[PDB]
Design a protein around this nucleic acid. Sequence first.
RNA 1: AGGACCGAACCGACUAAUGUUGAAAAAUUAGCGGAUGACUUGUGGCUGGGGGUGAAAGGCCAAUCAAACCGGGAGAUAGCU
RNA 2: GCUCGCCGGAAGACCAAGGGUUCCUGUCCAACGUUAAUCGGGGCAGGGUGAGUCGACCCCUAAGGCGAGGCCGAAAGGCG
RNA 3: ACACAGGUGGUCAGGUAGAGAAUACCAAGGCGCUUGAGAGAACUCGGGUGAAGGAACUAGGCAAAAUGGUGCCGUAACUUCGGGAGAAGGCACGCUGAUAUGUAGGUGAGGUCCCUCGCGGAUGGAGCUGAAAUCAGUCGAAGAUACCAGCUGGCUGCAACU
RNA 4: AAUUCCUUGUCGGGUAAGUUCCGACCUGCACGAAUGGCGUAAUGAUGGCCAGGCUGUCUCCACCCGAGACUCAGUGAAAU
RNA 5: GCUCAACGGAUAAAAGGUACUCCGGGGAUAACAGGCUGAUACCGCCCAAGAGUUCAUAUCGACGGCGGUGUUUGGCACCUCGAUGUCGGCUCAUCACAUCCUGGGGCUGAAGUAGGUCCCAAGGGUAUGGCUGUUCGCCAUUUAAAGUGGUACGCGAGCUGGGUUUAGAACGUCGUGAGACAGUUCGGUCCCUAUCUGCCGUGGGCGCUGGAGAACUGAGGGGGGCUGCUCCUAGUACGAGAGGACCGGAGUGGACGCAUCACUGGUGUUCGGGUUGUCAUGCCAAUGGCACUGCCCGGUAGCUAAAUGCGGAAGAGAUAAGUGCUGAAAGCAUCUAAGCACGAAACUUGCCCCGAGAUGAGUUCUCCCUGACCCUUUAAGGGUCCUGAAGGAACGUUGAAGACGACGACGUUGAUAGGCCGGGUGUGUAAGCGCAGCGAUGCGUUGAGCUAACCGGUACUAAUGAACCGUGAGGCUUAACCU
Lengths: 119, 123, 56
Amino acid sequence: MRHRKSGRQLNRNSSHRQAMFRNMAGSLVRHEIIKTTLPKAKELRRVVEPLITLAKTDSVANRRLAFARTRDNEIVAKLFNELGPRFASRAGGYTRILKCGFRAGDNAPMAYIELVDRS
Amino acid sequence: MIQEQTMLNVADNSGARRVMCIKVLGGSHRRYAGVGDIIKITIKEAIPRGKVKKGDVLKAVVVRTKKGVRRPDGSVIRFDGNACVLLNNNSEQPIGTRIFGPVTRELRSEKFMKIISLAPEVL
Amino acid sequence: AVQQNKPTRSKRGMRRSHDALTAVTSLSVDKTSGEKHLRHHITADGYYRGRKVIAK
RNA sequence: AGGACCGAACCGACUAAUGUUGAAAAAUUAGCGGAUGACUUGUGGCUGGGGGUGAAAGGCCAAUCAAACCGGGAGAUAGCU
RNA sequence: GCUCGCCGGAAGACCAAGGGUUCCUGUCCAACGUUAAUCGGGGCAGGGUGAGUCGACCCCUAAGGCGAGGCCGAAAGGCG
RNA sequence: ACACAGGUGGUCAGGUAGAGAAUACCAAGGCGCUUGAGAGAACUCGGGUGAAGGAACUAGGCAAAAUGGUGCCGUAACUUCGGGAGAAGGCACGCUGAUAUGUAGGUGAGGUCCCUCGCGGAUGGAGCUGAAAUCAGUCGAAGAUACCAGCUGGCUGCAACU
RNA sequence: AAUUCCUUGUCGGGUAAGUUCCGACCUGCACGAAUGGCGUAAUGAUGGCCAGGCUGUCUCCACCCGAGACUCAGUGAAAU
RNA sequence: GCUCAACGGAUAAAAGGUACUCCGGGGAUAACAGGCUGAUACCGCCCAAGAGUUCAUAUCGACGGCGGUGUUUGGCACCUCGAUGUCGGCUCAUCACAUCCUGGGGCUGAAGUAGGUCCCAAGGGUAUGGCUGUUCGCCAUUUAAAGUGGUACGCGAGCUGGGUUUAGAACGUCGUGAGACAGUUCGGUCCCUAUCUGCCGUGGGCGCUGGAGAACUGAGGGGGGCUGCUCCUAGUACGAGAGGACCGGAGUGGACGCAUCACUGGUGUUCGGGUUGUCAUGCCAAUGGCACUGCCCGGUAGCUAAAUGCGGAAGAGAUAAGUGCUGAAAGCAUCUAAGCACGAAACUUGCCCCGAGAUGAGUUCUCCCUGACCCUUUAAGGGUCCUGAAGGAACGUUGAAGACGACGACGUUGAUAGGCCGGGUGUGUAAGCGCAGCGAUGCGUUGAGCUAACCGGUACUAAUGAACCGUGAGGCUUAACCU
Ligand SMILES: [Mg+2]
Ligand SMILES: [Mg+2]
Ligand SMILES: [Mg+2]
Ligand SMILES: [Mg+2]
Ligand SMILES: [Mg+2]
Ligand SMILES: [Mg+2]
Ligand SMILES: [Mg+2]
Ligand SMILES: [Mg+2]
Ligand SMILES: [Mg+2]
Ligand SMILES: [Mg+2]
Ligand SMILES: [Mg+2]
Ligand SMILES: [Mg+2]
Ligand SMILES: [Mg+2]
Ligand SMILES: [Mg+2]
Ligand SMILES: [Mg+2]
Ligand SMILES: [Mg+2]
Ligand SMILES: [Mg+2]
Ligand SMILES: [Mg+2]
Ligand SMILES: [Mg+2]
Ligand SMILES: [Mg+2]
Ligand SMILES: [Mg+2]
Ligand SMILES: [Mg+2]
Ligand SMILES: [Mg+2]
Ligand SMILES: [Mg+2]
Ligand SMILES: [Mg+2]
Ligand SMILES: [Mg+2]
Ligand SMILES: [Mg+2]
Ligand SMILES: [Mg+2]
Ligand SMILES: [Mg+2]
Ligand SMILES: [Mg+2]
Ligand SMILES: [Mg+2]
Ligand SMILES: [Mg+2]
Ligand SMILES: [Mg+2]
Ligand SMILES: [Mg+2]
Ligand SMILES: [Mg+2]
Ligand SMILES: [Mg+2]
Ligand SMILES: [Mg+2]
Ligand SMILES: [Mg+2]
Ligand SMILES: [Mg+2]
Ligand SMILES: [Mg+2]
Ligand SMILES: [Mg+2]
Ligand SMILES: [Mg+2]
Ligand SMILES: [Mg+2]
Ligand SMILES: [Mg+2]
Ligand SMILES: [Mg+2]
Ligand SMILES: [Mg+2]
Ligand SMILES: [Mg+2]
Ligand SMILES: [Mg+2]
Ligand SMILES: [Mg+2]
Ligand SMILES: [Mg+2]
Ligand SMILES: [Mg+2]
Ligand SMILES: [Mg+2]
Ligand SMILES: [Mg+2]
Ligand SMILES: [Mg+2]
Ligand SMILES: [Mg+2]
Ligand SMILES: [Mg+2]
Ligand SMILES: [Mg+2]
Ligand SMILES: [Mg+2]
Ligand SMILES: [Mg+2]
Ligand SMILES: [Mg+2]
Ligand SMILES: [Mg+2]
Ligand SMILES: [Mg+2]
Ligand SMILES: [Mg+2]
Ligand SMILES: [Mg+2]
Ligand SMILES: [Mg+2]
Ligand SMILES: [Mg+2]
Ligand SMILES: [Mg+2]
Ligand SMILES: [Mg+2]
Ligand SMILES: [Mg+2]
Ligand SMILES: [Mg+2]
Ligand SMILES: [Mg+2]
Ligand SMILES: [Mg+2]
Ligand SMILES: [Mg+2]
Ligand SMILES: [Mg+2]
Ligand SMILES: [Mg+2]
Ligand SMILES: [Mg+2]
Ligand SMILES: [Mg+2]
Ligand SMILES: [Mg+2]
Ligand SMILES: [Mg+2]
Ligand SMILES: [Mg+2]
Ligand SMILES: [Mg+2]
Ligand SMILES: [Mg+2]
Ligand SMILES: [Mg+2]
Ligand SMILES: [Mg+2]
Ligand SMILES: [Mg+2]
Ligand SMILES: [Mg+2]
Ligand SMILES: [Mg+2]
Ligand SMILES: [Mg+2]
Ligand SMILES: [Mg+2]
Ligand SMILES: [Mg+2]
Ligand SMILES: [Mg+2]
Ligand SMILES: [Mg+2]
Ligand SMILES: [Mg+2]
Ligand SMILES: [Mg+2]
Ligand SMILES: [Mg+2]
Ligand SMILES: [Mg+2]
Ligand SMILES: [Mg+2]
Ligand SMILES: [Mg+2]
Ligand SMILES: [Mg+2]
Ligand SMILES: [Mg+2]
Ligand SMILES: [Mg+2]
Ligand SMILES: [Mg+2]
Ligand SMILES: [Mg+2]
Ligand SMILES: [Mg+2]
């Protein structure tokens, strides 16, 4: 039973989930809006939004942490140079889920997850 | 937390080094025996010239467990091994004359006042 | 692990009694573009609760 | 030197689990035996059914063997269903 | 296209055997593909295999097959 | 019979570690296995860890768990004198420095000499490569740290053995 | 005893307790000398037994990781 | 002229094996189980010769007699041979009472303690090992006790496959032999995705007579019911002593059950760290990937037991066996016929849970709706327009609720979830820099850094304005009241 637990398994093992959210968090920082499934979009908030909160304090150590989470220097540069000062006053809630219907191949409930200050 | 087939060390100078519990007394289907509990045992290893002999069948009182015993504050006292003091079958008084290693306050009673008297340390 | 008599088409219809689909109750209407969409979903043109949430 | 030793390829198939309308008309997974020899393998050949072949289990002889397969006698015969 | 993961004495590369156009390009999505398919070893049309030295053929023989005469066997045929 | 976890002979053989064509991770190269998406019940499948006990389970330690490397020390009954035997049992093992700015060893250039003269013979040691050991130090709970990789002994039936 | 019916023979060992095992006894139902007798080092994916280590084998199960089972979408069997 | 003697004589002339097997058939016919029966078996009873110092009947009971049960060994061959899988174990059981324990009694050759025996009683309880395939049995040690049976010798579309009972092989034995042996020995494929009944759970529909939200009553059903030991009474009663109670009270256990996570722990592949090999991030440094989570070390929440709380009752009613009181029939006697009293873990209650589909569909409380007209076949009729309530449902955020439904929380007038902030907890002194050291490294900055599910906060993000379903005063018949 699943009393008081957290984190979605998403029919993957633990290393695949960590590598999928490492790719997907970098893809959300890169394009500022992506289209994924609704369970993966809700679980992505627990990855990207700690990275943006990490990016508010530009130290050398925090660059190394954000690189250890994402492993892409282009994402770490965009986190601390752009998304750091863009969200510097917001107390969390850096992103937005927009449910966009159903995928044609498998009836998966999709959603757009985007950053708040995009448009 | 002693059951059948459990080997125990021997805590007195009765002459045994290694005994095995064969029955936990005092109740049908009784699984375990903590400290202060009487167990029927057999002897698996002895000194060459002791009061007891290899293969004797007799009783014993458990005085130290590796599982440990709990105190009413919630604390627990664990030991590194399992130790028992041999008893007579009938009179159920200890056979050896000198108890080795510590014992606990759960052991003391009207039944085992002699063993805590001879123990070097009573926790 | 297998039947001994042929179940009737009456029993077949009674098993399918619960297999009916539920149509969508009411489509919500956007306040700006005026088009219909699922409640709490974005529209086909990219509106949601008035604002244009995504270009096309 | 070795029908020597340990151990991959390769050859085999001891045990368990799975599988048993299977992924598979005998396999997979984890172990296992042999592994310079009475070894193993490619290609081609030869032996034919009361016959072959057999380090012999009545084993094998095209998913078939106490007498293969196909066609014929043939609509064998059936005091049996 | 960028990441991620997997094989790497193979899940890479070259052949023989075997298959026989599955090759390449255009086009099509009914059926076939255990789903969708714009994709395909699917349909349709076109294109593609260039040798004095590679291989075969050829020269040579092994096991073995066939076997002039011959010998043997009712016939068929058997052996050489 | 299938776009089938099977079967199928030859050739090619990169790096790091390693005795190695084992095995781990990679290169060249090639793939993600032609249904997905959720959920995170029982139960089944394949695994991980477990208090205390440690074969009480069971037809039976079946299955699991454990052992596992190298060097050195050491090793019984019995015996066909080969064995048994890796018997059993134990110790050492990383990294850094020093010995020695890289040693022993390997390789072997210039230089010089000789020569029936060359793809020659000495000498010569530059340069390259490079174990192993001792001593000192230092880190961790743990130094054969992963993968990999013997459980061992006693009695006995049968069959010599492969 | 791979042979022994009676039989779990008796005695001894091992075990707290041993129809198995090991050593004896001989009363061999119904061993026996190349359908070989008795021994026997080494060898055995061989049979029985015992011990150490080891452990979810078990006392008595608990939790966790994945693949199914469950729900949705697509396709869509079978025995009877 | 035939012991053609199997004598109405198959030929002048004929034995075996098959577990290597095969075909046609049979429940016409065996093995398993059911059935019928009850000889046998088991359990009762009748008579009482005796035993019991005396004394048949405390306990036994010869010779014999009568039954019960269906329970063994059997009888029969009725079902099944176009298949009803079988010994033992395992895992679930369930019933009987001819009761093993605990409860209540009577008699005793019952001093007490402890027994014997019989009666009542089926509520609960009712070992673990050694050997053997074993059931059984013996043995070891327990326990209040280690009940006897039915259940296809319960249970293989739940498991096992040791035994039996295929093909291999061997011994002894039998046979000339092929082979055979309820003689032995080693080895030897256990299939099935559940349509119906059943059962465990969980929903949809409709009903309950206007609709809706709640709270209930309890018809009925289920759960539960075990017991040791010590102390006091009291070394009292009893007894020559040895010994040693009833009754009553208190404590502490075993087994079982329910709940829980505060403690002690387990797990904790989502947290932290160490470390091996290798690859990559240009390199150093620092990280990440892969190697079972690479291998370990710890560990949050959650779930958990081995952890710790709690439970079995007391009481009442009516009783069984039993014990009586008064009391006749029958001047006496007599527990019974009239009348009355006591009496057990059984029975009904008391405790816990489900529970109005309890169609006999109950009760209470609250809320909501107070429009017009047409119609002909005039009726519990049909339709139009207006109206859309209480509420519900859907959707969304979700949950210590959950397979799915369901259930619960929340939807801006908002802490439902995520984030964020702070705290806690865990891990154990990050990175960078500086210093010391030839260097590995050490030290300082520094209990640093990171920190999941936790705690307290916070609208930052997501929970939309709506629409949808549900209507518009609710039948007849009496009765009692109201004017
Ligand atoms: Mg939560
Ligand atoms: Mg899936
Ligand atoms: Mg991994
Ligand atoms: Mg039928
Ligand atoms: Mg249905
Ligand atoms: Mg060899
Ligand atoms: Mg073979
Ligand atoms: Mg294998
Ligand atoms: Mg080998
Ligand atoms: Mg045979
Ligand atoms: Mg064949
Ligand atoms: Mg033939
Ligand atoms: Mg024939
Ligand atoms: Mg004819
Ligand atoms: Mg015919
Ligand atoms: Mg074609
Ligand atoms: Mg092509
Ligand atoms: Mg094409
Ligand atoms: Mg189409
Ligand atoms: Mg298709
Ligand atoms: Mg084509
Ligand atoms: Mg050529
Ligand atoms: Mg020739
Ligand atoms: Mg000719
Ligand atoms: Mg010829
Ligand atoms: Mg495929
Ligand atoms: Mg290599
Ligand atoms: Mg490899
Ligand atoms: Mg596939
Ligand atoms: Mg799971
Ligand atoms: Mg494990
Ligand atoms: Mg354990
Ligand atoms: Mg631990
Ligand atoms: Mg432990
Ligand atoms: Mg045992
Ligand atoms: Mg047992
Ligand atoms: Mg094993
Ligand atoms: Mg293992
Ligand atoms: Mg023997
Ligand atoms: Mg042999
Ligand atoms: Mg014999
Ligand atoms: Mg015998
Ligand atoms: Mg044993
Ligand atoms: Mg004996
Ligand atoms: Mg045994
Ligand atoms: Mg003997
Ligand atoms: Mg013989
Ligand atoms: Mg002879
Ligand atoms: Mg012989
Ligand atoms: Mg479906
Ligand atoms: Mg006759
Ligand atoms: Mg006659
Ligand atoms: Mg037949
Ligand atoms: Mg019949
Ligand atoms: Mg019968
Ligand atoms: Mg009779
Ligand atoms: Mg008398
Ligand atoms: Mg009598
Ligand atoms: Mg009699
Ligand atoms: Mg019967
Ligand atoms: Mg009868
Ligand atoms: Mg019968
Ligand atoms: Mg008859
Ligand atoms: Mg029947
Ligand atoms: Mg039959
Ligand atoms: Mg039938
Ligand atoms: Mg009775
Ligand atoms: Mg009595
Ligand atoms: Mg009952
Ligand atoms: Mg009962
Ligand atoms: Mg009852
Ligand atoms: Mg009751
Ligand atoms: Mg027993
Ligand atoms: Mg019976
Ligand atoms: Mg049965
Ligand atoms: Mg029974
Ligand atoms: Mg059975
Ligand atoms: Mg068997
Ligand atoms: Mg045989
Ligand atoms: Mg037989
Ligand atoms: Mg309902
Ligand atoms: Mg009741
Ligand atoms: Mg009681
Ligand atoms: Mg807890
Ligand atoms: Mg807590
Ligand atoms: Mg802990
Ligand atoms: Mg752990
Ligand atoms: Mg915990
Ligand atoms: Mg690494
Ligand atoms: Mg580095
Ligand atoms: Mg990689
Ligand atoms: Mg790899
Ligand atoms: Mg009562
Ligand atoms: Mg009177
Ligand atoms: Mg009277
Ligand atoms: Mg009364
Ligand atoms: Mg507020
Ligand atoms: Mg929140
Ligand atoms: Mg914090
Ligand atoms: Mg702390
Ligand atoms: Mg620092
Ligand atoms: Mg670190
Ligand atoms: Mg800290
Ligand atoms: Mg909170």
